[PDB]
Enzyme design. Structure first.
Site, PDB file in Angstrom:
ATOM      1  N   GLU A  31       0.820  -1.208   0.000  1.00 29.75           N
ATOM      2  CA  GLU A  31       0.000   0.000   0.000  1.00 29.75           C
ATOM      3  C   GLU A  31       0.860   1.267   0.000  1.00 29.75           C
ATOM      4  O   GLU A  31       0.803   2.090   0.913  1.00 29.75           O
ATOM      5  CB  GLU A  31      -0.965  -0.027   1.189  1.00 29.75           C
ATOM      6  CG  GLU A  31      -2.025   1.040   1.171  1.00 29.75           C
ATOM      7  CD  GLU A  31      -2.950   0.962   2.363  1.00 29.75           C
ATOM      8  OE1 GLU A  31      -2.957  -0.085   3.044  1.00 29.75           O
ATOM      9  OE2 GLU A  31      -3.656   1.955   2.633  1.00 29.75           O
ATOM     10  N   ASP A  32       1.681   1.409  -1.040  1.00 30.38           N
ATOM     11  CA  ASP A  32       2.553   2.557  -1.273  1.00 30.38           C
ATOM     12  C   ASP A  32       3.565   2.774  -0.157  1.00 30.38           C
ATOM     13  O   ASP A  32       3.979   3.916   0.069  1.00 30.38           O
ATOM     14  CB  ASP A  32       1.766   3.858  -1.487  1.00 30.38           C
ATOM     15  CG  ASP A  32       1.012   3.868  -2.799  1.00 30.38           C
ATOM     16  OD1 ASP A  32       1.490   3.243  -3.767  1.00 30.38           O
ATOM     17  OD2 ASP A  32      -0.059   4.503  -2.865  1.00 30.38           O
ATOM     18  N   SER A  33       3.966   1.731   0.560  1.00 28.12           N
ATOM     19  CA  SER A  33       5.007   1.875   1.563  1.00 28.12           C
ATOM     20  C   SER A  33       6.275   1.144   1.124  1.00 28.12           C
ATOM     21  O   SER A  33       6.234   0.124   0.430  1.00 28.12           O
ATOM     22  CB  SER A  33       4.520   1.357   2.914  1.00 28.12           C
ATOM     23  OG  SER A  33       4.031   0.032   2.809  1.00 28.12           O
ATOM     24  N   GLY A  42       5.521   6.614  -3.125  1.00 27.91           N
ATOM     25  CA  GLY A  42       5.038   6.070  -1.868  1.00 27.91           C
ATOM     26  C   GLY A  42       5.790   6.654  -0.696  1.00 27.91           C
ATOM     27  O   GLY A  42       6.782   7.369  -0.858  1.00 27.91           O
ATOM     28  N   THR A  43       5.306   6.330   0.501  1.00 26.95           N
ATOM     29  CA  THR A  43       5.946   6.748   1.739  1.00 26.95           C
ATOM     30  C   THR A  43       6.708   5.580   2.351  1.00 26.95           C
ATOM     31  O   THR A  43       6.556   4.430   1.933  1.00 26.95           O
ATOM     32  CB  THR A  43       4.930   7.283   2.758  1.00 26.95           C
ATOM     33  OG1 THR A  43       3.961   6.269   3.049  1.00 26.95           O
ATOM     34  CG2 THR A  43       4.228   8.518   2.218  1.00 26.95           C
TER      35      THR A  43
END
Ligand SMILES: [Mg+2]
Ligand SMILES: [Zn+2]
Ligand SMILES: [Zn+2]
Ligand SMILES: [Zn+2]
Ligand SMILES: [Zn+2]
Lengths: 49, 49, 64, 49, 66, 111, 48, 85, 1157
Positions: free
Chosen positions: I781-783, I923-924
């Site tokens: 999830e974009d991590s 992403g982060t």
RNA sequence: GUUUUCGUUGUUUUUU
């Protein structure tokens, strides 16, 4: 002269020949309507519309 | 993808170039990479979305 | 259906604002004009492409 | 297989092009001749992909 | 600007090679063999020197206040 | 085809002379009252397909951007020709490409 | 009430007068002009 | 999209050509749809004409104002309409 | 001569940028501004006359002022103590000054009393920082080394009050073109033939005209045409205005309209127009007809009415054609043909006019924009001479003449337009365009460069539409097709392509001569029968001749533009099908340099390039073998400029492969046109490189052509906001924000236009090691998962700098506040922050460890009346830490000390920090893990970062895979890898080389679980990639508020993370809570968490009309004398406001604590 | 001395 053209323009559109007014065209469309079976189950039937 | 220019989608295509390459059908996969014309067509689709 | 027009035109006779009335009668294709303070009369020819502003312009041309 | 599928679809597209450009393309119901050409070629190329 | 003291991906002492790297560059030399001469074996250490961008020379060519 | 008077140059209004009972094309501003070559007054066809061949320009053969082809030419017989279509923007304009060539210029169909 | 159109800070401490205050002042000065329209010479259209 | 899903009767819903006749009887038709062309004449004589396009026709039908309210109709559009002129 | 390869094309582009560059359009625009534009704007009305007709016996005492030459001065800033110095931009930025220079004029006087030189300062003009009169223009680099300017900082902007403002060029429709549109059916108008007929020179609006077609088919009577001329109050029939404009007979009207006489339908369709205009049979009645509706005053009578109608038919009607006498016949012919085009478009025999094709549109650069604004301001300059030489002419005093010239006339309009952003006058705040000038961004270096090459379409969302936002085929190769803003501005605000140049504006008269050189047939000669198929010729949109042999003239114009006698940018277009021809030299038409494939079939070079390896070698020299610059290639006829309007009439080769018309089964190659039926293709041109269809940002992405276009657009958008290093002398600049990477790294994957971009020298990002797997489960999830060792070593460590600006102010003339250390005695209403950091002058020393709740700049402000001083200091931001980088002490323009304190901080990645790739992969950070816990390779090698595999099925970034592969290959081989789009590189060969590198061809490699050392069952694709840090951090959004400051009016929590903002509870959140049955929760959110006041209302009147006093316990309803029937109400203060304005609007909302029933 | 004191208009760009 002018009145002849006026009547011509009018009666090019205001002579209803046949058909139901308000219906420009119709489509010949299938419908797979379900109908039960005499033995008890169901079955689809192609019905035109 | 229509003919954006005068009867053509790109100056690299011709007038009335009804063939796929001049109207936005991709002939490549994302693995292969896309030709500049069809790259611009995929840009069309992406900006559309 | 005739259509009276309460025009704001000011005539040169009585110097009364809100006095001139321009009425067009296209049933006979003939215009008409009057006043409400000095009660003058005016007439100008109106064709199929005529307006009350045309009436006042022609009145300016005629009187002056 | 992919390449020949795309090529076969392109050939079908060219056939549709020829039929439309000589009015040999039979008219679809509620689908005008040039727009029928465009739409059927669209179907063909989607089938290709 | 300035090559890292320690290799980001690996952690090898790499800082004392820059002047040596330029020395190797001067003799119209290929890059990879020169890096190998610099004991750069891990391609992480290799591109860290290969792709480092030092920038102080423009900064230093500014005349400072003192 | 409609026309104007020589000196009046306004419309030649078609009208009847009951004395003769024949069609005229008489300008109303002046005394110009011409006879009618045909008692037809106003022709207004509701299906229009004319004009796609009258407006043809000579130097269309010297247009570089046109597509080439292996298509045939009745007049110039060039084995590498161009294909254009009827100028109509109508929805029902059949996509009948009127082939043309360098020297022909004719609005001919190779359908 | 002044709470409704308070002194609103145009710059930190310097307060610009509220738009409501401006308009109320304009309306009331016009009203006093009207109040002055009677005792003075008012040649018809001035009152208008 | 004004569109009415008329359901034909079972026996017509299994029929096509009678359904086609019903369809044509529902499709509104004016001459505007089927008028191929219109060219107004002033016909010099009320009871005949001097034009090749209607000479025999009016000679056969004629057996008032001479000004003529003339128009042409499309035979193919008549038969597609399943009507006659 | 030989074949043209890609590197030769790169050399061509090198010539292009070495002469032009990418600012050439702006430079030449602003130079044209102060070399042709300014002088013309000054002398556009060079005659100022006054008089005293009376006596002096009788006399015309004629005060007559004649205008003269302008003067330009070098920038000098003129200190406020007479210590005048020549101004340097660095000083201007330090002291917050304007890069502006004084200008002067010669308004000489000529006295003509009849019986019947002087140098004043016009104003101060802000200057673009790389014009020819800039302070540092002749000064060389070593001089620049003394004045501390970034050599890569490439000017192109304006400096005003220390703020750098850039004038965004505005794209607008090109004028003087027929625009026929299909009007809505439920309207008397059917087709609107529009032309914005305005003077080509200056490109300024004079007037416009829209001819509307009335009637329907078998409906609405005849097809009458009545258009509303400019400043008339009625649609006047066109035949009537033809009578009024000179040609009273209708056959002349057709000779002007009818040009295919073989058609009868148009004759019978224009018959009703003849019938309706038949009431008009001469020029006199037609002109009177127009004048009656001409919106003129009353009493003008028929004579002056006709005269005014004739003037308005003459002036403001086709003013681009003529405003003077003699060409009203040309007016008749042009209007006739324009009506004819209207009628043909109405018949639908031609496709309706397109509304996006750039050929009908231009771009107004900084040059013409400033020209228009100066036109405005100077038109309010020439007149204040009149409005002062009248109050003194009656006295006839010895007027100084240096006091009537309010020189700040042209200072304030430009200041307001460039500062506020509204191009006009502050009085006319309404109807003003906002955004044409904006603050230059130096967040990154590209945040300037790309920022200097925008375009904008200022239509507005008045009607949403997708046409202004949707990419069009005409945008190919002319604009960047991936750079677009976000939602509100997406599609709009468009960028150029790479090789574009804008027409700076050349005189049209040379083009007129070039065209007339070929035996032009006048418009009067244009006849339906004679010119049945002749070519109508147009200039800049104005129709200026006919011809029957156009092939020779078009060939000569093409070859002559190849030569250079025609300005190489001038557009030549030949409408062969519609017997027409058109030349465009107006400002704003954009051109691209096309390699000139021989189009005249007379040689083997037909289907080949005139430019050959001889020209390539000459360019590689950089000079000529007896100079060969870029203009040398352009004027040699081997490369020429082309516009979009020309482009749609030319057929262009993509790559050097398809130049010669050609006559297996590789899954790593692209596709050229099939060439199956069209056995031949004579491409008139070929692009220097298809990869030049890209933009400045787009020239960064490694293989942008292997990834989804939406992700390409996301890359374009994120590229400008990606962290990096903007300027070399970032330190000497005192900017709101400055970000510098610890260790800039050149990308492993590179383009070739990269070489031109100098990205080795200002790289944005680092080459870090990434492996693909699902190891931690936090990668979802974009991590991303990070190597802590790289962070400790400083990977993507950076430096942030924030400049606080402070200044003393003048309350009166002597009433001044001072920068001093606040204390408990002299200063009232102190703040809880520690003031100790201040030392003597309210200035902290450079290098101190500053933090929040600590005052950095102390200020004390007088109290209006012994102990009359208030703290006016500006402490450091609460949640901000660091060390003072720099402290600048200067003054303002006049007399007040102005301090610029820049503080420095070191930024290090943390969980949640935002990053992105060069493939839209954003992403982060999800979690950071140390070296020992993450798996290692066979050589024990761990990645720097870990990503989510789920992106590939969804986001589908093949180019990312290619980039990683090339990155591994380059790192092993030790060189810079190329990733230029539209090249011949094959992934399979790279895999083979990786095999040669002794590594798995598909990049897989066994990882060994960091916790166990066990061979992870799958072999992990593991290697370097070039990624970029992004402006968004985690700790700048962390913000909690239990209770803080409240807005002065609402008595509710303030908005904004800066000032402890509260969470604005949206209405949908209310609705979902209502569906959730959250009565008490939402109530306390509106009661205790929001406004809540208690009041005392009446029980009789039911209003808040109660004097209330809790301590006195008295509650008297002055409305109803109610004291005992008074009720207390604990309700939101917003309800009180609502009740208040309801009362104020003379509405009585009688609250009732009871039920009437 | 418990406690204890900032704001708006307009403008631009932005953020899944
Ligand atoms: Mg979100
Ligand atoms: Zn009167
Ligand atoms: Zn390493
Ligand atoms: Zn006549
Ligand atoms: Zn009460």
């Amino acid at each position: 002269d002018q009145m002849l053209k006026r009547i011509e323009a009018h009666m090019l559109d205001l002579i209803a020949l046949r058909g139901i007014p308000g219906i420009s065209k119709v489509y010949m469309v299938k419908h797979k309507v379900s109908v039960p079976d005499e033995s008890g189950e169901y079955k689809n039937e192609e019905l035109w519309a | 993808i229509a003919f954006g220019f005068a009867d053509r989608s790109l100056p690299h295509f011709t007038k009335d170039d009804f063939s796929p390459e001049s109207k936005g059908f991709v002939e490549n996969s994302y693995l292969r990479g896309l030709t500049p014309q069809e790259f611009f067509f995929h840009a069309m689709a992406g900006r559309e979305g | 259906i005739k259509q009276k027009l309460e025009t704001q035109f000011t005539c040169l006779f009585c110097n009364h604002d809100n006095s001139v009335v321009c009425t067009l009668d296209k049933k006979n294709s003939i215009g008409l004009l009057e006043c409400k303070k000095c009660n003058l009369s005016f007439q100008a020819p109106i064709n199929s492409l005529s307006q009350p502003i045309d009436i006042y312009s022609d009145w300016i041309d005629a009187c002056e | 297989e992919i390449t020949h599928a795309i090529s076969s679809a392109k050939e079908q597209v060219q056939e549709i092009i020829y039929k439309a450009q000589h009015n040999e393309l039979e008219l679809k119901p509620g689908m005008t001749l040039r727009e029928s050409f465009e739409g059927e070629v669209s179907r063909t190329l989607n089938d290709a992909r | 600007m300035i090559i890292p003291v320690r290799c980001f991906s690996c952690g090898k002492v790499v800082g004392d090679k820059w002047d040596a790297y330029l020395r190797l560059l001067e003799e119209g030399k290929q890059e990879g063999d020169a890096l190998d001469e610099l004991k750069l074996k891990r391609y992480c250490c290799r591109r860290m020197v290969l792709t480092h961008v030092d920038l102080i020379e423009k900064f230093l060519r500014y005349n400072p206040l003192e | 085809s409609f026309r104007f008077c020589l000196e009046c140059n306004n419309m030649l209004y078609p009208k009847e002379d009951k004395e003769n009972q024949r069609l005229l094309y008489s300008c109303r501003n002046c005394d110009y009252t011409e006879l009618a070559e045909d008692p037809k007054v106003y022709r207004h066809e509701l299906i229009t397909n004319i004009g796609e061949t009258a407006g043809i320009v000579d130097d269309i053969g010297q247009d570089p951007t046109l597509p080439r082809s292996d298509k045939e030419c009745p007049e110039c017989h060039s084995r590498d020709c161009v294909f254009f279509q009827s100028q109509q923007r109508r929805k029902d304009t059949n996509m009948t490409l009127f082939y043309v060539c360098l020297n022909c210029k004719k609005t001919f169909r190779d359908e | 009430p002044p709470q409704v159109r308070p002194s609103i800070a145009m710059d930190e401490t310097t307060q610009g007068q509220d738009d409501l205050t401006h308009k109320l002042s304009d309306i009331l000065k016009a009203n006093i002009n009207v109040q002055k329209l009677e005792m003075d010479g008012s040649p018809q259209h001035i009152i208008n | 999209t004004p569109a009415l899903t008329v359901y034909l009767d079972r026996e017509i819903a299994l029929d096509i050509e009678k359904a086609k006749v019903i369809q044509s009887s529902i499709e509104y038709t004016t001459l505007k749809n089927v008028t191929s062309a219109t060219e107004i004449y002033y016909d010099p004589d009320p009871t005949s004409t001097v034009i090749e396009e209607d000479f025999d026709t009016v000679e056969a039908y004629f057996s008032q104002s001479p000004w003529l309210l003339r128009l042409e109709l499309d035979r193919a559009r008549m038969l597609d309409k399943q009507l006659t002129m | 001569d030989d074949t043209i390869t890609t590197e030769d094309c790169w050399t061509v582009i090198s010539a292009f940028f070495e002469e032009k560059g990418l600012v050439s359009q702006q430079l030449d625009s602003f130079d044209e501004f102060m070399e042709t534009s300014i002088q013309d704007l000054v002398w556009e009305e060079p005659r100022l006359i006054l008089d005293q007709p009376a006596q002096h016996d009788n006399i015309n005492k004629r005060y007559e002022i004649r205008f003269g030459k302008i003067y330009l001065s070098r920038p000098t800033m003129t200190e406020a103590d007479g210590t005048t110095h020549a101004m340097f931009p660095q000083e201007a930025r330090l002291r917050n000054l304007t890069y502006s220079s004084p200008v002067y004029l010669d308004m000489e006087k000529s006295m003509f009393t009849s019986i019947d030189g002087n140098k004043v300062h016009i104003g101060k003009v802000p200057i673009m920082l790389r014009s020819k009169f800039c302070s540092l223009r002749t000064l060389d680099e070593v001089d620049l080394y003394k004045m501390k300017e970034c050599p890569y900082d490439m000017g192109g902007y304006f400096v005003i009050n220390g703020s750098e403002k850039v004038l965004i060029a505005q794209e607008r429709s090109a004028a003087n073109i027929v625009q026929v549109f299909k009007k809505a059916a439920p309207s008397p108008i059917s087709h609107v033939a529009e032309i914005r007929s305005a003077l080509e020179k200056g490109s300024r609006l004079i007037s416009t005209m829209q001819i509307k077609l009335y009637g329907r088919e078998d409906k609405g009577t005849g097809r009458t045409i009545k258009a509303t001329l400019p400043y008339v109050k009625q649609d006047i029939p066109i035949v009537i205005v033809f009578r009024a404009l000179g040609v009273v007979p209708d056959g002349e009207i057709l000779q002007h309209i009818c040009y295919d006489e073989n058609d009868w339908q148009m004759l019978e369709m224009l018959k009703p127009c003849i019938e309706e205009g038949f009431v008009i049979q001469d020029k006199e009645v037609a002109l009177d007809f127009i004048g009656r509706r001409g919106s003129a005053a009353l009493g003008i009578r028929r004579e002056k009415r006709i005269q005014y109608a004739k003037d308005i038919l003459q002036k403001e009607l086709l003013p681009h054609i003529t405003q003077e006498e003699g060409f009203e016949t040309r007016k008749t012919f042009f209007l006739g043909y324009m009506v004819n085009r209207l009628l043909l478009c109405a018949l639908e025999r031609k496709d309706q006019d397109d509304r996006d094709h750039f050929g009908k549109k231009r771009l107004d650069l900084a040059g013409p924009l400033l020209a228009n604004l100066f036109r405005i301001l100077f038109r309010k300059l020439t007149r204040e001479i009149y409005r002062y030489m009248q109050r003194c002419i009656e006295t006839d005093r010895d007027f100084n003449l240096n006091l009537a010239v309010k020189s700040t006339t042209i200072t304030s309009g430009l200041k307001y337009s460039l500062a506020t952003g509204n191009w006009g006058e502050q009085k006319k705040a309404m109807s003003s365009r906002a955004g044409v000038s904006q603050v230059l961004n130096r967040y990154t270096y590209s945040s300037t460069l790309s920022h200097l090459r925008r375009t904008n379409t200022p239509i507005g969302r008045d009607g949403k539409l997708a046409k202004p936002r949707q990419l069009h085929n005409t945008h190919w190769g002319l604009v960047c097709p991936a750079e677009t803003p976000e939602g509100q501005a997406c599609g709009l605000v468009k960028n150029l392509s790479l090789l574009s140049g804008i027409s700076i504006g050349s005189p049209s008269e040379p083009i007129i001569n070039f065209l007339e050189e070929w035996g032009m047939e006048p418009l009067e000669d244009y006849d339906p029968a004679q010119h049945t198929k002749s070519t109508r010729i147009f200039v800049n949109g104005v129709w200026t001749g006919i011809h029957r042999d156009p092939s020779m003239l078009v060939s000569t114009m093409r070859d002559l533009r190849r030569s250079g006698a025609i300005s190489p940018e001038v557009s030549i277009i030949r409408d062969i099908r519609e017997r027409e021809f058109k030349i465009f030299t107006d400002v704003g038409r954009v051109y691209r340099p096309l390699f000139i494939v021989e189009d005249d079939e007379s040689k083997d070079n037909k289907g080949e390039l005139r430019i050959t390896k001889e020209h390539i070698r000459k360019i590689q020299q950089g000079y000529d073998d007896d100079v060969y610059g870029w203009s040398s290639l352009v004027t040699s006829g081997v490369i020429e400029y082309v516009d979009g309007e020309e482009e749609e009439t030319i057929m262009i080769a993509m790559t050097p492969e398809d130049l010669q018309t050609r006559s297996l089964n590789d899954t790593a190659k692209r596709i050229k046109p099939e060439m199956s039926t069209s056995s031949h293709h004579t491409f008139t041109h070929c692009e220097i490189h298809p990869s030049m269809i890209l933009g400045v940002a787009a020239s960064i992405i490694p293989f942008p052509d292997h990834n989804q276009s939406p992700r390409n657009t996301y890359q374009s958008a994120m590229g400008k906001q990606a962290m990096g290093v903007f300027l070399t002398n970032y330190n000497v600049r005192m900017d709101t924000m400055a970000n510098i990477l610890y260790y800039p790294q050149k990308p492993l994957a590179k383009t070739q236009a990269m070489e031109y971009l100098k990205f080795r020298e200002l790289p944005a990002g680092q080459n870090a090691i990434v492996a693909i797997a699902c190891y931690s489960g936090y990668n979802q999830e974009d991590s991303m998962i990070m190597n802590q060792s790289s962070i400790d070593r400083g990977l993507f460590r950076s430096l942030f700098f924030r400049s606080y600006m402070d200044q003393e102010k003048r309350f009166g003339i002597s009433i001044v506040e001072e920068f001093e250390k606040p204390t408990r005695a002299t200063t009232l209403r102190l703040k809880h922050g520690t003031y100790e950091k201040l030392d003597e002058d309210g200035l902290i020393a450079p290098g101190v460890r500053v933090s929040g709740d600590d005052i950095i700049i102390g200020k004390t402000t007088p109290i209006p009346p012994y102990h009359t001083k208030r703290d006016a200091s500006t402490p450091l931001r609460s949640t901000e830490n660091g060390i003072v980088d720099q402290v600048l002490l200067t003054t303002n323009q006049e007399g007040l000390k102005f301090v610029k304190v820049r503080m420095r901080t070191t930024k290090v990645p943390q969980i949640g920090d935002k990053f992105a790739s060069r493939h839209g992969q954003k992403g982060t950070i999800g979690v950071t893990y140390r070296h020992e816990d993450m798996p290692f390779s066979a050589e024990g090698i761990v990645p720097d970062l870990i990503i989510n595999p789920h992106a590939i099925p969804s986001r589908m970034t093949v180019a990312h895979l290619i980039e990683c592969l090339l990155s591994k290959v380059g790192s092993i081989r030790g060189y810079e890898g190329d990733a230029t789009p539209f090249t011949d590189l094959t992934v399979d060969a790279v895999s083979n080389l990786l095999r040669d590198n002794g590594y798995q061809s598909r990049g897989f490699e066994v990882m060994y679980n960091g916790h166990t050392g066990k061979k992870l069952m799958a072999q992990v694709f593991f290697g370097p990639t070039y990624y970029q840090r992004l402006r968004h951090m985690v700790d700048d959004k962390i913000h909690a508020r239990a209770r803080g400051p409240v807005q002065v009016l609402t008595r509710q929590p303030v908005e904004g993370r800066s000032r402890d903002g509260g969470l604005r509870f949206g209405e949908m959140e209310r609705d979902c809570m209502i569906a959730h049955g959250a009565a008490g929760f939402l109530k306390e959110r509106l009661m205790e968490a929001s406004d809540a006041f208690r009041v005392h209302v009446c029980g009789i009147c039911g209003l808040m009309s109660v004097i209330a006093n809790l301590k006195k316990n008295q509650f008297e309803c002055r409305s109803c004398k109610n004291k005992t029937n008074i009720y207390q109400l604990h309700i939101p203060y917003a309800a009180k406001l609502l009740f208040q304005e309801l009362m104020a609007m003379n509405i009585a909302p009688r609250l009732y604590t009871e039920r009437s029933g």
